Amino acid sequence: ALSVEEKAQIVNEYKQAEGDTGSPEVQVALLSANINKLQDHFKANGKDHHSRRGLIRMVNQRRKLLDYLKGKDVSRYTALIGRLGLR
Amino acid sequence: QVNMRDMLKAGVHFGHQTRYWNPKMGKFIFGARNKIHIINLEKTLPMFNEALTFVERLAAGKNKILFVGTKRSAGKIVREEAARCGMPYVDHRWLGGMLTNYKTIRQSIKRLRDLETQSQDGTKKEALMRSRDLEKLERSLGGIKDMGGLPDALFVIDVDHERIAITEANKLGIPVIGVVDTNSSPEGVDYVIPGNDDAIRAVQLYLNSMAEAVIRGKQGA
Amino acid sequence: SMQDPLADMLTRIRNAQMAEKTVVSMPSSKLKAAVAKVLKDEGYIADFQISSEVKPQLSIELKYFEGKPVIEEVKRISRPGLRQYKSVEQLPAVRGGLGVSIVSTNKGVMTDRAARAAGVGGEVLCTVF
RNA sequence: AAGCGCGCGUAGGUGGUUCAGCAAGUUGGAUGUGAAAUCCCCGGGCUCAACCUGGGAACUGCAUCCAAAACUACUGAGCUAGAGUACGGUAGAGGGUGGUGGAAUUUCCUGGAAGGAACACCAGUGGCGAAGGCGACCACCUGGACUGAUACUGACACUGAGGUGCGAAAGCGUGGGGAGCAAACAGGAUUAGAUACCCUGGUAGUCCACGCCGUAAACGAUGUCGACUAGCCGUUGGGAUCCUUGAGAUCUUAGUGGCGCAGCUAACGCGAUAAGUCGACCGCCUGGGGAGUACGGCCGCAAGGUUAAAACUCAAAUGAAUUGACGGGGGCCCGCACA
Known part of the structure; x- marks a missing residue:
């Protein structure tokens, strides 16, 4: 998984009436942080496709959570596409 | 008749295990008690009261009933509590075919009618094995001396072993009555009687409810 | 998933x-x-x-x-897939008219007897027989 | 005859839940038509029938128009059940890298030295992964579900042609290794003959790194998903109930099995892990041969694979089941059949 220090760290800018861990600030961008740091083990273990099928499972679900923000909230979408180093 | 102190006395509230039961007797389980299932004791009261009403309102209307209590532990009173009644009965090896193979077995009653010379006399080797087989008939034809043709009502004891005898009864349309335990299904019997048939002293709580009532149907005529 | x-x-x-x-x-x-x-x-x-x-x-x-x-039986006709939007002249008398043939209309989700004597057709929902 | 081996998911098909709105589909009426002919009935006529016409009926159609708002789309605010995440806790042959092992067996040599490979027991109608698949010991970087709840999201949904990855082993690449076996064979014994099973021998191969093939008796010969309709007996992971010492019951779930009604089925049999009742969608089938074959396209170094025909030809091939017969099928029994 992610680091025990980190998975409780990254929520500190996702707060937005802080008790939310459910809006797509969290399941995009905890999950975007899952994308950006678990690249490491692939370089050593390139013969195990079980771990990047989870990557494509949630980067679609991130894009699915981008897809609902296409219509529900375009303005807070700019906080996602403008930030995080996307695209 | 309907009172509790002989209803509670012997065997009735006992029943078959939580390993051994059909849920169609799920309307008749009065609590689970050491993993054996209890006859429902309060709506028992209309059913085995109606078991004495219907048995006398046709005994005054001239029927004649058969008694299938075909069990090894229950055939003892079935020779005794159906001798006090005027009914035909069979308690050991219901032969598959009674009231269907009937016009074959109608003339399979007579090994004593055709030997009314020698059973009163003693033809020694050639008449012993005919008279050793003289109990091969009334082992299954024990109450079937009088038959009147086809039976009119039918009262069963063990639905679980002799399921044949009820599928004999539904195959014609003769009205079905009998005691049922939680092991078998209360389905095929026309109107139910919930009650145990595994204890030996639980048997004659209904069999001496018959000999009480079988004279109380013949008294109307 | 559930779809209807x-x-x-x-x-x-x-x-x-x-x-x-x-x-x-x-x-x-x-x-x-x-x-x-x-x-x-x-x-x-x-x-x-x-x-x-x-x-x-x-x-x-x-x-x-x-x-x-x-x-x-309750036979579904208009399921969600082929959804059987039907007129008032063509209502189904299911079992000789002993099925009541409930049909969704504007003024009421209503049986076929009152669907014809007050004429609106529509979603022929199910057999009730 | 027919479920791709399974996934991620594009268009699309369909879409939990509530009020309100729209009036595209849906619903009614209005009007123009839908030519005439033909047809359908009532007729008129040929002396009768065709035929001929008169009258209508019919023309399920098309747009326009107003009226309707239960449902669908669309529009907006929502609702928490579907679906997801923040918190541990185990269970788990997940999978991969590097090592550390042991006995045989094998190969040497005077019990040691030497290296390959699969790891007896633990082994399980057990786990794990979408699937293919996967067990000595050990760390190291890493998955998805379960469950205990507590938090929050507000259908974000499932399915999905194309499209895209990923799929047992013999392979043949591009480099290495090296025990046993063994594809390739030589004889040995054997038969009309071995080209066979048996017998003496051994390179390719399995192994490794990257890469290609993408094949299957990929089989549970059962697509994925959700809902609901009697049960009963083991067994796997949690959790709570439990007089409690567990020797453990019960309950609760998510898996893995046995047997059985309702149920279906051609039958065998399935039977809440359906092969029922259903719903959305997808793949697939149309008599047996020809044939998964030619030809054309695509991929491969090759072997080939994938998509996929007709010409001809036959009135049958096939499925489960039953009687008889047969069996170098088993099991009992009889008789000088065996001494």
Whole structure:
């Protein structure tokens, strides 16, 4: 998984009436942080496709959570596409 | 008749295990008690009261009933509590075919009618094995001396072993009555009687409810 | 996934009609509640029982006949896929007219007898027979 | 005859839940038509029938128009059940890298030295992964579900042609290794003959790194997903109930099995892990041969694979089941059949 220090760290800018861990600030961008740091083990273990099928499972679900923000909230979408180093 | 102190006395509230039961007797389980299932004791009261009403309102209307209590532990009173009644009965090896193979077995009653010379006399080797087989008939034809043709009502004891005898009864349309335990299904019997048939002293709580009532149907005529 | 609200209730009672159960409870909608009200007026069921709480539910009290109960089959016609929008001249007299043939119209989700004498057709919902 | 081996998911098909709105589909009426002919009935006529016409009926159609708002789309605010995440806790042959092992067996040599490979027991109608698949010991970087709840999201949904990855082993690449066996064979014994099973021998191969093939008796010969309809007996992971010492019951779930009604089925049999009742969608089938073959396209170094025909030809091939017969099928029994 992610680091025990980190998975409780990254929520500190996702707060937005802080008790939310459910809006797509969290399941995009905890999950975007899952994308950006678990690249490491692939370089050593390139013969195990079980771990990047989870990557494509949630980067679609991130894009699915981008897809609902296409219509529900375009303005807070700019906080996602403008930030995080996307695209 | 309907009172509790002989209803509670012997065997009735006992029943078959939580390993051994059909849920169609799920309307008749009065609590689970050491993993054996209890006859429902309060709506028992209309059913085995109606078991004495219907048995006398046709005994005054001239029927004649058969008694299938075909069990090894229950055939003892079935020779005794159906001798006090005027009914035909069979308690050991219901032969598959009674009231269907009937016009074959109608003339399979007579090994004593055709030997009314020698059973009163003693033809020694050639008449012993005919008279050793003289109990091969009334082992299954024990109450079937009088038959009147086809039976009119039918009262069963063990639905679980002799399921044949009820599928004999539904195959014609003769009205079905009998005691049922939680092991078998209360389905095929026309109107139910919930009650145990595994204890030996639980048997004659209904069999001496018959000999009480079988004279109380013949008294109307 | 579940894809049709009222075909999920019309299946779930028929296997309970051949089972020995009486009160059927499921999470229900107003769509499933408007269907249930018309066939209790046709003598099939009674007391739909909106639970009137959060996650509202329907407790349809279906009646038994002696032995085989009152509703043999409920045949879905307009399922969600091919959805059978039908006129007033072409209403189905299901079993000689002994099926009441409830059809969703603007002025009421209503049987075929009142659908023709006040002429609106539409979603021919299900066989009630 | 027919479920791709399974996934991620594009268009699309369909879409939990509530009020309100729209009036595209849906619903009614209005009007113009839908030519005439033909047809359908009532007729008129040929002396009768065709035929001929008169009258209508019919023309399920098309747009326009107003009226309707239960449902669908669309529009907006929502609702928490579907679906997801923040919190541990185990269970787990997940999978991969590097090592550390042991006995045989094998190969040497005077019990040691030497290296390959699969790891007896633990082993399980057990786990794990979408699937293919996967067990000595050990760390190291890493998955998805379960469950205990507590938090929050507000259908974000499932399915999905194309499209895209990923799929047992013999392979043949591009480099290495090296025990046993063994594809390739030589004889040995054997038969009309071995080209066979048996017998003496051994390179390719399995192994490794990257890469290609993408094949299957990929089989549970059962697509994925959700809902609901009697049960009962083991067994796997949690959790709570439990007089409690567990020797453990019960309950609760998510898996893995046995047997059985309702149920279906041609039958065998399935039977809440359906092969029922259903719903959305997808793949697939149309008599047996020809044939999964030619030809054309695509991929491969090759072997080939994938998509996929007709010409001809036959009135049958096939499925489960039953009687008889047969069997170098088993099991009992009889008789000088065996001494």
